[PDB]
Amino acid sequence: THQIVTTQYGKVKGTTENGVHKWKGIPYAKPPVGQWRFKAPEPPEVWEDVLDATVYGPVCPQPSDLLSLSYKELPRQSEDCLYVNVFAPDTPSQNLPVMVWIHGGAFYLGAGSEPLYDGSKLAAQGEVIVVTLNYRLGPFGFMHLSSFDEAYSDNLGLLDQAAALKWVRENISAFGGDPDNVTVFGESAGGMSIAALLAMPAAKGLFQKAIMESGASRTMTKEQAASTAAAFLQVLGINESQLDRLHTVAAEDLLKAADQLRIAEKENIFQLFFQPALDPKTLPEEPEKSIAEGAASGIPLLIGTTRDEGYFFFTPDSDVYSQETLDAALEYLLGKPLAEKVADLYPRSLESQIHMVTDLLFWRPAVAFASAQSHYAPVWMYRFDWHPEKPPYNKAFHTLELPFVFGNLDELERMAKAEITDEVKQLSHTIQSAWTTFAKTGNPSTEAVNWPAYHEESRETVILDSEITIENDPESEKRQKLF
């Protein structure tokens, strides 16, 4: 019971708290620092001593937008951030299902070790193993320089994720898990990453089930990636023959360059500058397209969105984008033809701006992904409607279902100043129960909810809220409009 586990790279020593074995800060790759910056993740150097796995590793460098809110104590940052954490219920039973979390944060923020993602409650209550992890963010993970050198790899953050999943397949049995029953789950950028992992050749067979919360197919073209890379190099004063400084410049300077780039190219929510990109060697094509071809055949999918996603990105006092920028967004998201047809739906205003986020950045991609996958595997869809009744947090906004999934309800205080009522504890119980039953069986049905299979003929959807309900082909009008 002293919890020493041998990984393929060396022994790690965990701890046991309240019936949950925990190992924090386990290296799964070589620190992508200096000369290893912008390169695919490599195995970490082996160690023959006994690594103390009781403290979280550093988080990837990022502006403090999210850290200063998610932590009461700002965590240490460093490009040396590739670590995984394992939470396992103290049970005699071995080969427990494994749930691997990929955190969100629009590809430039977050960490697997945010308090919100502590997997103790989820592990104990669902009797599954929970794995959390960090992957390169912003310019460290979603700055694609392949066009400047075949030695560099694009979609680094996604390759990091794939490497962590490979680590799980190769090592989790040692922690009491079943490497053949791995469920990957994530929200926001994590859901979008899972969309990509489902379509990435180098991720084949790394997981058997998937949960995509508020996030589906999301990529920029190969052309845009090259365009943004050149623009980025300029801000750094680096050119085709000075690619040396890329491996010597301080990480802190890469973050500044990124923010300047953000400002220079006037980045807006509809087209993030750092996100996955098409690339023959890593992400051959749009996830949605690959899935429609059956690339994820046989893999059960639990997918959904929150009813009021957009209200998380804009406050009542937020500036309203110009027509010029709005048209450019609609056109980029739906294409010239559909953009014009739907222009009607979004007449300039804060309202339309927000509805554009919910509808085009989350709902439409979700329905498109669920619909496509329904021809090759079981699909289960939901819409999260819960929210405090009284203002100003009376909207089912992006991120709000997270405390319920993980059961860390204290987070609801900072997220929506909501108290933990029996109503809240009950919704969390139903959600955790469905998520863990799905990880165990590939079907999220539980005594609390009999989840109907989602297919294009009826599009039955489960509505998560104080009272569970089922809607058939929700928002039919809009769907028919957007499709």
Ligand SMILES: [Ca+2]
């Ligand atoms: Ca022991």
